Amino acid sequence: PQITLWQRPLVTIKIGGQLKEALLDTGADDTVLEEMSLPGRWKPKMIGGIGGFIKVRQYDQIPIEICGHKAIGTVLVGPTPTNVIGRNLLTQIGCTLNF
Amino acid sequence: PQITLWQRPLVTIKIGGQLKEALLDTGADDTVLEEMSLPGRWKPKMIGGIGGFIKVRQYDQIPIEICGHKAIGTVLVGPTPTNVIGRNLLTQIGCTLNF
Ligand SMILES: CNc1nc2ccc(S(=O)(=O)N(CC(C)C)C[C@@H](O)[C@H](Cc3ccccc3)NC(=O)O[C@H]3CO[C@H]4OC[C@H](OCCC(F)(F)F)[C@H]43)cc2o1
Ligand SMILES: [Cl-]
Ligand SMILES: [Cl-]
Ligand SMILES: [Cl-]
């Protein structure tokens, strides 16, 4: 698809058996989601943005689907004010900026 | 251009006759630059991100070139960790997301 930027680029993702809404975020290195359970190992991480840092749990090798597009990657979980899909997964679905 | 997302989508901008580096950021409604001088009067704004909120100065109708593409619009100035070009200007230069 070609996604306009007149509005926030929100999509539905499928992760950990749940459907969630998230922002396609080229300014985010990493994918960060609000609190949720995920299986497998994790390690603590601090990530920083406008306003400072938050502590998150880093889960690796997590399957996700974004717009029919399957991928696998790292998902950070913690008290983000909004769910963001970062570059680590945007690359896997072949997402580019165009102008 | 078509810009992939394996690295940060950093581009050169020009504002007030000076070159700066900034991130093309589809997750940002607005454009926020690190401390700098701009002309005219400013208005207050609070913008929120991953770690909370910051206060910025809002300047309107500012000419800014992004990857050579000419825009004139609102620029917020304050203690952001990185210069970000948000959707207010990405739409002026005809930017879309594609996959
Ligand atoms: C109302 N209008 C309004 N206009 C706005 C304009 C902007 C913002 S915004 O910036 O809050 N943000 C909103 C979004 C999160 C919904 C945009 C987002 O793309 C942000 C951009 C950025 C990139 C780099 C640093 C800081 C911010 N990315 C981000 O947070 O990424 C995190 C997860 O991945 C890492 O990589 C990048 C960053 O690294 C942190 C490194 C350090 F710790 F800062 F050094 C880490 C809100 C605005 O509100
Ligand atoms: Cl990853
Ligand atoms: Cl590619
Ligand atoms: Cl604007």
Side-chain angles (χ1 to χ4, degrees):
Chain A
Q2 175 161 114
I3 301 301
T4 185
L5 294 173
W6 296 118
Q7 291 86 32
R8 294 175 175 166
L10 294 170
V11 295
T12 296
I13 65 175
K14 194 249 75 119
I15 180 173
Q18 301 175 56
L19 294 173
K20 298 183 164 270
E21 188 177 68
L23 181 63
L24 302 179
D25 188 354
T26 60
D29 295 340
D30 313 300
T31 294
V32 71
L33 303 181
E34 307 169 339
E35 281 298 342
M36 69 174 295
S37 173
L38 289 173
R41 83 246 95 48
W42 60 269
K43 56 183 160 178
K45 189 184 189 177
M46 291 279 274
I47 56 303
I50 269 184
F53 291 76
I54 59 165
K55 188 184 176 187
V56 296
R57 304 190 315 273
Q58 178 184 325
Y59 295 88
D60 297 319
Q61 304 184 110
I62 301 298
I64 191 159
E65 194 186 313
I66 304 148
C67 295
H69 289 85
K70 293 195 174 51
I72 191 157
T74 293
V75 178
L76 311 182
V77 178
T80 177
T82 217
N83 295 328
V84 176
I85 307 166
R87 294 187 296 98
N88 76 303
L89 296 171
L90 297 172
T91 57
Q92 300 299 281
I93 66 173
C95 187
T96 61
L97 292 161
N98 297 79
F99 61 102
Chain B
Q2 174 162 281
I3 300 174
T4 60
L5 296 168
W6 304 99
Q7 307 166 355
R8 288 179 184 150
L10 298 174
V11 301
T12 300
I13 65 172
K14 182 164 69 167
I15 183 172
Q18 295 302 309
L19 300 181
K20 295 172 185 274
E21 290 229 289
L23 180 64
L24 302 183
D25 188 355
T26 58
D29 301 333
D30 302 314
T31 292
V32 66
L33 304 183
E34 301 160 17
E35 179 57 44
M36 64 174 300
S37 290
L38 285 172
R41 284 182 66 79
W42 60 272
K43 307 280 194 277
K45 197 181 172 70
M46 283 268 280
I47 59 169
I50 249 309
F53 285 83
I54 62 170
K55 289 157 99 95
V56 296
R57 306 196 309 272
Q58 177 179 321
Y59 296 87
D60 297 319
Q61 218 162 317
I62 300 293
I64 174 174
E65 224 178 55
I66 302 149
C67 285
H69 284 70
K70 294 169 195 310
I72 308 176
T74 296
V75 174
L76 310 179
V77 176
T80 176
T82 76
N83 292 331
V84 298
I85 308 202
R87 294 187 294 97
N88 74 307
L89 304 181
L90 298 175
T91 55
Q92 288 198 26
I93 70 172
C95 194
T96 57
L97 288 166
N98 298 263
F99 58 98

